Design a protein around this ligand. Structure first.
Ligand code: HEM
Ligand code: HEM
Ligand SMILES: Cc1cc(N)nc(CCc2cncc(CCN(C)C)c2)c1
Ligand SMILES: Cc1cc(N)nc(CCc2cncc(CCN(C)C)c2)c1
Ligand SMILES: C[C@H](O)[C@H](O)[C@H]1CNc2nc(N)[nH]c(=O)c2N1
Ligand SMILES: C[C@H](O)[C@H](O)[C@H]1CNc2nc(N)[nH]c(=O)c2N1
Ligand SMILES: [Cl-]
Ligand SMILES: [Cl-]
Lengths: 362, 362
């Protein structure tokens, strides 16, 4: 039953992967070995080339990602060899360091051993490798509300946050065979953060806003040819709106628009004044300015959309169907100023791809 | 075949309409009369009450409309009695006058005789009753590009535009039996226009922008209980973004963002400066300010979304399913600052409703 599904996924993947790599003549033999490996073992093992191209295809197929033009330059780190929590920890520290690259961010994925019988070898609890803690208790909100449930799980395991608005959560993951996950404080030297200032408005620094340099999603599953890599953290560089229009702006996140309005010297009393819109534009300008001043890679939503248009053009040129989720591709500010807003996209799921999975906390 | 479809639509509509009106006991008899009327005539005729409530239901069911909270206060004008082009013209002039209401806009629909054998009695060519002409010839763009095809059709019929950027198109419609439509110049006294100025930036008036007061969609079909009212123009008041973020901003419309950037004194050289976003916010502030100064009804997108939230709440309270098109309901600026962005909607089509129809030009 499962080896039927596996074998079928393998045939589809290997065929497509080898076509793209100019190695179609090797398919039959490779497929032969896989058939035997599955029969004899219940699974199969990707070559380094297959794993690398698979991760790249999965990014290429990610409907919700505007940044896909650069899919083929993804840096794939093969860590299927890790067996200990120390090795996992050091691999995660290494990912942070190499992806950060002193600010010139390298899109990277680190791939850990895949599920066996659907049994995870390693299970990463963090949503992103770098993220801020959040607390809520008796009227008091501190930090990132989105992190409240994971923060509480961490404090159940003996970690204690300082309760600033920007506590770095520890790395937290569980090894096969262990009942509880382990946690490790992030070395501050590894984590680039960017204080938010505004190019023109000197008072903006009074808000004492900052954000971290590199978004590293660590809780999605990479599926490649029937093999389930549930632990495979990946990163790009930020699009500014992610920070300025969502992380710092949403009422259910840092909720800073009223405070932004005050420091930029506009009233926040009347909807018709469009003060939220003005505050959003200034906050987003500040975010882009700040990352660039500090030499940390970032892209604005106009440039990103222009790049995505090139991705569309390349898909058609290569004779590949384009898939996308319009609702996620449009930027959260000035969406109609982008070409994305004015066309539609097929939201079909194509594999290899990255998928959500259930949180082991909650 | 057709009388089957008609009768079935009639049963569903009359049943629902009379439930809502507290007249469920009258359904059986009314349904009896309709059954006979269809058999004997091939069609049936709505009571004034049915027609009025039907138009209101159609608005309530319009998935792409954020303004639906006020569905039950729609002003329905029954003009099923018109037979001549003079009467149609005067009914259209009347709609403009009564809906405008000296600036305190009244949501209104005027309903003309419905299709018979699918044969239209009157066919309105205008997309909106008030709209600006557009011209393109040998490098030269003037006016509203969206109106180019209708403008060209009008000039085929002996009309000539002055070729300003804001020529009012004439009313243009065709009567049953006539090969060509007729056209009538709009009396300027009927048409309120609003010059666009900015509350703070005096130079904004140098752009010489203006827009008309009342959006009156005149080319959609109202379907009520199997009866097809192909000529039934309707209006609300504007949401500011329609004018400021789309009509005046789109590259394929008036394309004013670069000129806005210049008058507000910011550079339009770098994507990372978010100059388009800033220009959009200032243009949208100017639009709202200008309509309010002139005493013409308008709503900003924040207030409109708050009203739409109340519409959602009322639907659930009344035990009615809510339908909506997320892609049209989100405003084109700061969409994530509205609740709409953060939930989903069922885009199912429910009747009565308003529908697109093929343009007789093009
Ligand atoms: C190189 C720079 C990149 C940029 C600028 C970029 C941009 C974005 C943005 C703006 C989002 C929406 C995030 C949100 O609203 O939560 C997104 C989602 C996504 N990106 Fe990218 N991305 C990049 C690289 C990558 C890479 C390297 C991968 C994988 C190898 C990836 C896979 C995805 C996936 C799977 C999502 C959806 C995540 C979810 O559903 O929560 N992206 N991207
Ligand atoms: C009272 C004030 C109203 C406001 C503020 C409002 C708001 C809006 C907005 C912003 C749109 C999107 C238009 C576009 O992007 O092209 C829209 C679409 C629509 N509205 Fe409303 N509306 C109002 C009244 C009405 C009325 C009275 C009706 C009908 C009786 C109506 C039916 C519709 C329909 C059918 C659409 C979709 C049109 C299309 O597909 O092009 N609305 N509305
Ligand atoms: C790889 C990558 C690049 C990039 N520019 N951005 C992200 C995602 C940032 C991000 C990751 N995960 C969750 C949220 C908020 C998620 N909500 C929907 C739960 C944001 C990922
Ligand atoms: C009734 C009503 C109220 C309101 N506030 N707005 C509109 C629509 C304005 C409008 C009407 N028709 C076409 C466009 C642009 C349409 N493109 C998609 C073709 C805009 C209609
Ligand atoms: C292709 C895409 O659906 C298209 O740009 C839509 C998006 N949402 C919209 N929403 C509104 N209100 N009006 C529009 O014209 C559009 N255009
Ligand atoms: C319900 C709705 O789909 C939801 O708000 C989505 C909309 N589009 C989005 N787009 C991005 N990029 N990120 C998000 O978190 C969301 N949220
Ligand atoms: Cl993020
Ligand atoms: Cl309009």
């Amino acid at each position: 039953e499962e080896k039927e599904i596996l074998w079928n996924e393998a045939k589809a993947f290997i065929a497509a992967c080898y076509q793209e790599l100019g190695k179609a003549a090797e398919v039959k033999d490779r497929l032969a070995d896989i058939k035997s490996e599955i029969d004899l073992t219940g699974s199969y093992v990707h070559t380094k080339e297959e794993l690398e191209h698979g991760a790249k295809m999965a990014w290429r197929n990610s409907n919700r990602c505007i940044g896909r033009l650069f899919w083929n330059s993804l840096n794939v780190i093969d860590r299927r060899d890790v067996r200990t929590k120390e090795e996992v920890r050091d691999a995660l520290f290494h990912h942070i360091e190499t992806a950060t690259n002193n600010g010139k961010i390298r899109p990277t994925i680190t791939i850990f051993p895949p599920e066996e019988k659907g049994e995870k070898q390693v299970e990463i609890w963090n949503h992103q490798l770098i993220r801020y803690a959040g607390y809520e208790s008796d009227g008091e909100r501190i930090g990132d509300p989105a992190s409240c449930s994971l923060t509480a799980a961490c404090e159940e395991l003996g970690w204690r946050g300082e309760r600033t608005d920007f506590d770095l959560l520890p790395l937290i993951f569980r090894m096969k065979g262990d009942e509880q996950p382990v946690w490790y404080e992030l070395p501050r030297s590894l984590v680039i953060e960017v204080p938010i200032t505004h190019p023109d408005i000197e008072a903006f620094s009074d808000l004492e806003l900052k954000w971290y340099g590199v978004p590293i999603i660590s809780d999605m599953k990479l599926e490649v040819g029937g093999i389930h890599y549930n632990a495979a953290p990946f990163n790009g560089w930020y699009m500014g709106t992610e920070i300025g229009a969502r992380n710092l702006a949403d009422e259910k996140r840092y909720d800073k628009l009223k405070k932004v309005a005050s420091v930029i010297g506009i009233a926040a009393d009347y909807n018709t004044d469009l003060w939220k819109d003005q505050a959003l534009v200034e906050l987003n300008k500040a975010v882009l300015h700040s990352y660039k001043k500090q030499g940390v890679s970032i892209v604005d939503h106009h440039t990103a959309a222009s790049q995505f248009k090139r991705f569309e053009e390349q898909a058609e040129e290569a004779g590949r169907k384009l898939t996308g989720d319009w609702t996620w591709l449009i930027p959260p500010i000035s969406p109609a100023a982008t070409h994305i807003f004015h066309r539609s996209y097929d939201n079909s799921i194509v594999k290899p791809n990255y998928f959500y999975q259930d949180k082991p906390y909650e």
